[PDB]
Amino acid sequence: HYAKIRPWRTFRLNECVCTPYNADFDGDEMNLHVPQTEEARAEAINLMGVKNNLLTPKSGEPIIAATQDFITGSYLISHKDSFYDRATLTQLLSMMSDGIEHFDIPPPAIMKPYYLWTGKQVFSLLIKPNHNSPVVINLDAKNKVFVPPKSKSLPNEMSQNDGFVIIRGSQILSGVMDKSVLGDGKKHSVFYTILRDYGPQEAANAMNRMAKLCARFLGNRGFSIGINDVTPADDLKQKKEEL
Amino acid sequence: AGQNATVAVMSYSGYDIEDALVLNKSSIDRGFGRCETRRKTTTVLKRYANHTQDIIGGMRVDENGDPIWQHQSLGPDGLGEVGMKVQSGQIYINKSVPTNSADAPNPNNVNVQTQYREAPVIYRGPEPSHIDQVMMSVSDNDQALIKVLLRQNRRPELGDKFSSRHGQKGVCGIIVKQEDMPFNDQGIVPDIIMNPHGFPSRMTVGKMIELISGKAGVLNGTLEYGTCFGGSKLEDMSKILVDQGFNYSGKDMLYSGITGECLQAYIFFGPIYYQKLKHMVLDKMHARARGPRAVLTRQPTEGRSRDGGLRLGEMERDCVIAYGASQLLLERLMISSDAFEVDVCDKCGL
Amino acid sequence: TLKYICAECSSKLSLSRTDAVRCKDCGHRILLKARTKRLVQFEAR
Amino acid sequence: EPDREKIKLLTQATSEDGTSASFQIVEEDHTLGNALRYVIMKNPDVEFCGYSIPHPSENLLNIRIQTYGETTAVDALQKGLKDLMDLCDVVESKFTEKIKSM
Amino acid sequence: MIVPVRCFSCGKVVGDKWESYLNLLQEDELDEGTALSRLGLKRYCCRRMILTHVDLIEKFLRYNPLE
Amino acid sequence: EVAVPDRVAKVLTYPEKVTRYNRHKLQELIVNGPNVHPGANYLLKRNE
Amino acid sequence: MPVCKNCHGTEFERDLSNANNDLVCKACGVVSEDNPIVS
Amino acid sequence: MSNIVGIEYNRVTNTTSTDFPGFSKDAENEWNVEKFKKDFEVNISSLDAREANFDLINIDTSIANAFRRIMISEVPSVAAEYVYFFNNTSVIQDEVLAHRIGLVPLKVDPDMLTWVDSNLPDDEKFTDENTIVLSLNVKCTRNPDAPKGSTDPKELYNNAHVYARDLKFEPQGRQSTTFADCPVVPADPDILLAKLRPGQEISLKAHCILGIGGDHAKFSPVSTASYRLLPQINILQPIKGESARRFQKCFPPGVIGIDEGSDEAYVKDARKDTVSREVLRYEEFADKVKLGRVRNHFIFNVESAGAMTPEEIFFKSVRILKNKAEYLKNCPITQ
Amino acid sequence: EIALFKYRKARLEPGTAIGAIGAQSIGEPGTQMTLKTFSMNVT
Amino acid sequence: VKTAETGYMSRRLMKSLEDLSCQYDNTVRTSANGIVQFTYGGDGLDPLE
Ligand SMILES: [Mg+2]
Ligand SMILES: [Zn+2]
Ligand SMILES: [Zn+2]
Ligand SMILES: [Zn+2]
């Protein structure tokens, strides 16, 4: 890793790379080292850098994409029904790459009766920020579970949910950002695609602009598990009582 | 053995990943989880079998200047005061022994007590502390036993463990100033925020009943039950919560901190008894420099006590072999550890 | 010097340089030490 | 007094003529972040203005005001920041003229 | 030990909240909750200290060997 | 990046041989002092 | 014990800070020895 | 959108204020300084010495969040920090006792003092307006008297429960000038700091400072400066008959009432209830009575720590927000 | 172009401790659920 | 107990397979400049990427 100088003497690394360390944040100490000569410092950073080590070598899938809050908040961002206001989309698009780089606002998914951007276009803006970044990619995959398209339909997109995803020109057109589409799974995630298409640097930049996005938005949206959330209904009770 | 605090179960600010709590400034500043760490340091002064005694006299004034940084908090008695502070270098208890009594000469009329060299024990510590109780006494064999304990009032900092009594652990992630945490109609800002992800895979639903039971206990007045297989049930509990005017499930509508509008999903919050553990970050921080080495291998010591040393190998040095690093694995096991100068030869090169 | 508070009846006694340390009429063996008369300073944080 | 400490234009985020500028303002927090975003955003020339702190332990805030081809984003913040003062002056005047009763 | 001067989460003062509670529990008895309702407690995180907090300083000041 | 706090960053050094390029920066970290964070603890000249 | 380079026969002081505690001289500043070896 | 949110049993709807030009095909009316002055009239309920319920109108949640954010932390207050001691032989250690001395409010109005710097040490820290010094000394013996008191230690020991009124005030020179027209006291005199016993002694000298709420917790003048979105009941298809009794027993006995006999259930007022939403459980009111939480109202409930009236607090918050914006307006831009 | 550029790059670059990578790969999956349900008496 | 056995299994699996290079003849070679397989996996490709 590189260094960073912050107060509050406990360590900080990130949370996207917590999976290879298998950390649990339960009073878990974990020591660091420094190289000494100018040979071994570059030998560490060019051969063991985090941008180089996006893959575990046991099968070649991406292992460092994100973790639980990031995936479950991007699912709430891009579900199917999270139409954003222009002020809300404006704040949410500025709050990923705070002031370092700019964006080109696309035409929204819905014209004159109230202008509302679909959350999938909002995740599409996360991948391709501008036309100055050659980050055009293509993907077609599956959101880890789907009810199959019960009729006689050739694509797996005509289901009760989003199901089969598709990316054409760094733009998602259907789907959510759950597991095995985002990472920690099979070899068809978005970050693996950015990696194989345009190197390690843009792959790291997409993750570090998704992290500041979702960590700062999920504290604003709201999410809880109350006793109403885990309440068995009377129908389930009377079905269990006879079964 | 703890402290009570209201707590909003939500995913807040991304510092709530895997048992990662987030505390509240100006709520922790009002005496929430304040610690007192007490360590004693007893140095019994003994008289030797060489007709001598260890005088604990000190107080080098050095031109009437409220004396120097070594002997500042010692006073004109030899023993340290009560209430004075010490920050990594003041001598708080004196111990002066002679060296002619280290051997066994005859008890001649020559000066046995001719030198009173200074070998005390000093408070080596990262943070300043105070002395609140120092006592000198007697032991079994008529010698001056001295016990002194030092205490520091540790403010609970960032990195400190905070675990619920119900079965979920936690280390704080960041501290929030006052008002970036979501309030309600009454305007009560919660203290801590727990992970919603900590509930399913750890499979805890009794804490989700504990917030409701604590809310009704602080509402109706009575300290409520909750023992094994009995106690106060939930059916009358929801009736009490809906009879006062709150929600029947412990939920509440909350207003966001950084933007002021409402929260899209409801957030439930109530008191949980939160105990603090013996894992203060000052007691677990470690460092290493070019410091002490052993007499046997000229390598650093173990643990944290002597100086410290953090080994790598037998499963750890093989990782950079799996990477293919050559010069790092050479340097951090040869040059940074010990650079030695064995002379060799060609003919019988021993 | 007025220090060396007792631990059984709390009497202010001043032992000499050779005492083989003993208390006053309480009949005790150990003794604590009184607080210094200086001015300790810190903020209320 | 040449007291340049608060506002600072990012030389590595703006365009050539103007129209977009990252303003790194110091010693300020969410006390005026959404109070200034809401006023600059309802300018019909300004089309994209949002605020985000880099890190909470640092006392920094970055705001990026994008606009169309009419006005400069440097001078757009001037008119979008005078109007919050006008808001507070109107609220203070009405509160003073109402608190004289009862 | 001693009740704090202000509560943790909110900021309402908790002075004249403890002795006026035990004085109201000994003389002019109320059950548990109308005591706080007549003393003036509204927000229920200001009510988790007077209801809570066994008094430890009255048991700590017992240990003084004729001080 | 791992955030290394200054309570363990001021005790954890890295040698830098001056190479007529960082002479001003290393002179700044010498004149600044080892108490504050951008500084230097120890030094070893050309002579033994 | 008085082995030094710039001065001769001065006093010494093992360090208290930085967990380094080497036996160093005064008024110029030279360690004048190896690392400390303790048991 | 009619300035109202939806309240469903699992989530809310239309949280964003969305009242800007550039939202649907035209200018959903712009700022227009004459219109914002014409369409702004507030409604004050009451002002006590420790209670204010003054409302607000025609502004979004953003600047209302600003006016509750600066009110709770970013307005100055007055409290003691530096507590000098003299041979405190109590059982309470000096850090916790000085914390109790600091954190209690001190009833004295600001703008009689200025701010302090971090440099210029102790002989020059307190320059002619910095210090409200509060000197204290207390000790007791066994009280010479004949009570019995075999359980309660009230008449047995002198002043064993020291209060906030024991903290005296020492004026020096010009400090007595601000004391003549404004005598200083603490906020509440019946605030328990410590508990002592005979043989123990507490004497000290605390210095004061002017601070902002970002430093410590004692620099906040308001306990709770929050607001409330007003609940608007939007009941349709009236419920006359015997269902109004269950409709009254389900809601609080406040906001809703019944005329007479077999009439419908009207609404008494607006500023009475929170949202209990028990009606979203039963299969009678789940699709018959629709409530909500309207914007535009922002019911305040502030209370003082004892330092100043809340009509001074809100005015000071508005003035310090205007000054904080003016200091950024007059700042030159330098890359 | 793209398929051949991804195939010539996927050739194993010489000078790599393939035995060390493989031995870290085999020794890694220490989960070992060991479902002893059902072919009877097989480990 | 399973992790206690698996740690020693992964440690004693290592030393028999620790020194195994891959020279520029597209072969995999041992410590004594021997050979165990003439091209890695039959193809000679990287199993990581
Ligand atoms: Mg662990
Ligand atoms: Zn005695
Ligand atoms: Zn409270
Ligand atoms: Zn020297």
Coordinates of C-alpha atoms in Angstrom, one line a residue, chain A residues 68-84 92 117-120 122-123 162 175-178 213-214 217-224, chain B residues 10-11 196-197 263-266, chain H residues 10-11:
Chain A
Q68 CA -21.7 -5.3 2.1
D69 CA -22.9 -1.7 2.5
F70 CA -21.6 -0.8 -1.0
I71 CA -23.4 -3.6 -2.8
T72 CA -26.6 -3.3 -0.8
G73 CA -26.7 0.5 -1.3
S74 CA -26.0 0.3 -5.0
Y75 CA -28.9 -2.2 -5.2
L76 CA -31.1 0.5 -3.6
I77 CA -29.7 3.2 -6.0
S78 CA -30.3 1.2 -9.1
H79 CA -33.2 -1.1 -8.2
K80 CA -35.8 -0.3 -10.8
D81 CA -37.8 2.5 -9.1
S82 CA -35.5 5.1 -7.8
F83 CA -36.3 8.1 -10.1
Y84 CA -34.1 11.0 -8.9
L92 CA -25.5 12.3 -6.0
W117 CA -33.5 10.0 -14.3
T118 CA -33.7 6.2 -13.8
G119 CA -31.1 4.9 -11.4
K120 CA -29.6 2.6 -14.0
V122 CA -27.1 7.0 -12.7
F123 CA -25.0 3.9 -12.4
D162 CA -34.6 -7.3 -14.1
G175 CA -30.3 -4.8 -14.1
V176 CA -29.2 -4.2 -10.5
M177 CA -25.7 -4.2 -9.0
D178 CA -25.9 -7.2 -6.7
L213 CA -20.6 7.4 -3.8
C214 CA -22.4 4.6 -2.0
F217 CA -25.5 8.0 0.0
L218 CA -26.5 5.0 2.0
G219 CA -26.2 7.1 5.2
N220 CA -28.7 9.4 3.6
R221 CA -31.2 6.9 2.2
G222 CA -32.0 4.8 5.3
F223 CA -32.2 1.1 6.0
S224 CA -33.2 -0.9 9.1
Chain B
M10 CA -29.1 2.0 10.2
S11 CA -26.3 2.0 7.6
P196 CA -28.0 -3.8 10.0
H197 CA -25.8 -6.4 8.4
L263 CA -35.5 9.2 5.5
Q264 CA -37.0 7.0 2.8
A265 CA -37.1 3.9 5.0
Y266 CA -38.0 3.9 8.7
Chain H
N10 CA -43.0 0.4 4.8
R11 CA -41.5 3.5 3.1

